[model samples]
Target: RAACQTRTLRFVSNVTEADRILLRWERYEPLEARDLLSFIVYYKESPFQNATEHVQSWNLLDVELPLSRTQEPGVTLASLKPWTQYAVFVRAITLTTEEDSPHQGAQSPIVYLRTLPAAPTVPQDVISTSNSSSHLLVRWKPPTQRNGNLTYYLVLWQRLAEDGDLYLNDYCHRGLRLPTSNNDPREAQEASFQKKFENFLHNAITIPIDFEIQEDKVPRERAVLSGLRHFTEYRIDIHACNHAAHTVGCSAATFVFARTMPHREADGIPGKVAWEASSKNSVLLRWLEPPDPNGLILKYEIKYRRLGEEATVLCVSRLRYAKFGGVHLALLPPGNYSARVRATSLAGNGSWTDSVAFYIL
Candidate 1:
């Protein structure tokens, strides 16, 4: 009987907004003793063009792996840049008696990956309020290009405050300093300003005349932030960055002062909603609790309606018990629908939650 020989290569990688790229590959073959001297990883920006035009660039991405025994048979390439497109190929160099050089081996198939988009454009029509003593709520429209790859948004914020006046020369010198720490007095003051602006920006949730809609449709990315303090002004800059590192086009900055809202205006907390499954007849909904909960949550208001039937409200509920749970609804007929939620507080309504859509059969 002869030993069965089987050698296979598999490649895998995950694109994330953190600007880190992971690549892995595996090999399966006749069980034998072999030493892999090096693993060469090559990448290029464009794969569709000629090979010469798209030159191969190699990175010492992988090193020696002792194949003395059966192993997982993969390597990880890390620390990749964001918002960039890359095509990767891998080759394992092993020890072989047949070849003059150490053992020569095969290359893996090319894999195409693109980092998340740059942060998404700052949402238009941002609205905010101080629903609690600890948290602020912000809501905005989605970026113009809302693709499936979008993961979450990264919010940049600062506080709005004034520090002792600095001479013009002093201000110029301050700019030269290595990115000033947020804690620095002047920097802190600037951060305070930013934070205050964010509060105001949050309140300006209604779309303005400046918002231009093009004929070629692009999915807009929208979101809201909760868990903020009441009666405090904050400046915030928000951008949408996807798992691919594609950030929103730009951000809208504004000053906002959190004020006490009457009980009637109190909404629910703001949180991220997850997409479970969709079909022609119905859709499923689920969400995770806000990452930080410094305050108490009253309830969640779920609002939904069909596309063409804007006049009719399909579903509305105030869920008081389960803070984080899944809900499903069957459509009366096949159509597109929009869904959103709002958190309530003793002070007033927080921001309206981000809206999601689905089609029913």
Candidate 2:
């Protein structure tokens, strides 16, 4: 008759990746691996890493055997840091009686491994392309799983230089630090290029290649990158920003490669604006790239102000059409607000037309 407390496992082997490692092993002869009470895996940062405590006191991930253990036995380990070395071993144990103390057969040899550098948490189905000689669209679906509170996204774009290293790979940091544009109607209290440049330097450059940072926030859906060089090959990486609580770069990201429309100068000028009652507190705006398009158009800039005051600017990119939409008439002390639209084309940006005055009653 076979002894009951006899050990069974012979040795183990494993496959490793950036964030996960899969382990496989063999057993001693033929035993009712079915009686396997638990499978224990131990790992740490050092090769000889171990605690002088009882097996119960050692930190481990234990999974109770279900029906039985199979040949080429394996378990997948996760959450391992990237590009770092680690030591690990696994133990197979089983007991017949309920009161019987567990007995671990044989374990794997001390295995040391280095993980691949971690890839940034990435959005799925990344897409990048363009309409004509002036712009490009970069879009991605929200990642099924997120690491933290997403603050915004970074759209880092670089023009390819002959025989040069990829900008994103060399820099390691790709962040979009554009100032968050909002409908804060206090005109003077709104956006400023001077301070925006400062805020950007504080967050992202501190990333990117040679452009200003921005697009304060969009987690789902996508982004339209405008004002790109015509007929240019560009590599763009769209990194998601997160509130890591406390972490370096404070965010993680992934990217894609793309190109812009071919070089061809086109110009556009938007038509005079038309408006109507949108919401009790909003005005619907309507117009066309309606301006003359010397080539494919890019985006539009809108400026509005109370009667005789400095104009507040609002810019929108990726306009495939000519029509503008609803304007939130946030509490602007019932009065006259004058506005105008200008179009940007592959050639150059056109001038703003005469102000279209509308009363916010």
Candidate 3:
């Protein structure tokens, strides 16, 4: 009763790749050369405890290890899938004849090996929203085909050009084509934008794998890009990368476009009014625009009146200077007066400046 005990069997270092695995095992020499017939290599999908339970169903490599060979015995398993695990072992097949049945010898220890990973699939259900006038928020589920453990994700964003194309920068390049025709114009336009974003890459921000817990208790990865221009369009890309050993590889990009909100509030009230001089009973008033429009100044609303009389309202054009004398008021009467002015944007009117006291002499 000879046993086929092997000293060592394991994956060959620096040789295994995503599609292939190289295995090397020490040769087993029986007490008598006549009892040995060949070596049997067995491999199966991982998580198996017993190698003999379903021996015949496992992948097999039966080859003769002739004593005449000088090098150690080994085999290269081909056509294997990437980023997968397979348990492997080797056993000796004893001599079998017509009269007596052959028997398998003691089995070697099982060794588990995993193939190297490749680029992951695109992130799932990517979406974006305008968090504020200066920020854009993006959210997405991790890639479904994350082939292996992901080290980090790269978030990229690029501004949209005023001319309707993506604004190109260092990471942006020309690639991909959009389908020209579709029955629904919205669907066609969405697909066109998606295709256009495939080539955009700029302002990258790296985020860790641990996802954030949302208010709804759903876990997801989110990136908040700040300091963005208000009321501007931007395209965002989510890239999942394994890069386990400093190897640079990432998934195909998942993209979405969003526009930051228009200015929510005015920069501030307009500057104080300056009573430059008096005319034929008309007052010439001048002031500065809001320190920061936060948006384009659409117009200005000027309110003024005699100190004890009802207020008079005047709609002024989009300018910092205005005249108080007009036929509507039948010329400015000589009296004490106070005035305040406010600017208006598309979002509407801002707070008025503090009332300035003046006199019509």
Q: Top model by lDDT, which number?
A: 3
Candidate 3 worst ten-residue window by lDDT: 177-186
The CA lDDT of each predicted structure is: 0.47, 0.54, 0.61
Q: Give the Cα error of residue 306 in candidate 1, in Å.
A: 76
Full ranking by TM-score: 3, 1, 2
Is candidate 2 or 3 superior in TM-score? 3
Tens-place lDDT digits, model 1, residues 258-344: 332233333444456766655556567786544322222334456788776663332222242243265666645776778886553
Q: Any runs in candidate 3 off by more than 4 Å, and if so which?
A: 1-15, 29-36, 47-53, 64-68, 98-106, 164-220, 243-245, 265-361
Global lDDT of model 2: 0.54
Q: Global lDDT for candidate 3? A: 0.61
Highest TM-score: give the candidate number.
3
Q: Cα lDDT for residue 297, model 1?
A: 39
The lDDT-based order of candidates, best leading, equals: 3, 2, 1
> Per-residue CA lDDT of candidate 3, range 1-361, in tens?
4443334433344256877888766666644435456777787776444455335568988867756656556777888766788877777666544343334354567777788877676788877776568877777888776778766667777776444131222111232232111112119999989777644432232333312222111223777788776655677777777764443366666767776676755545644567654556766666666654533455567788898879988765542232332112238779888887776653456777788777777
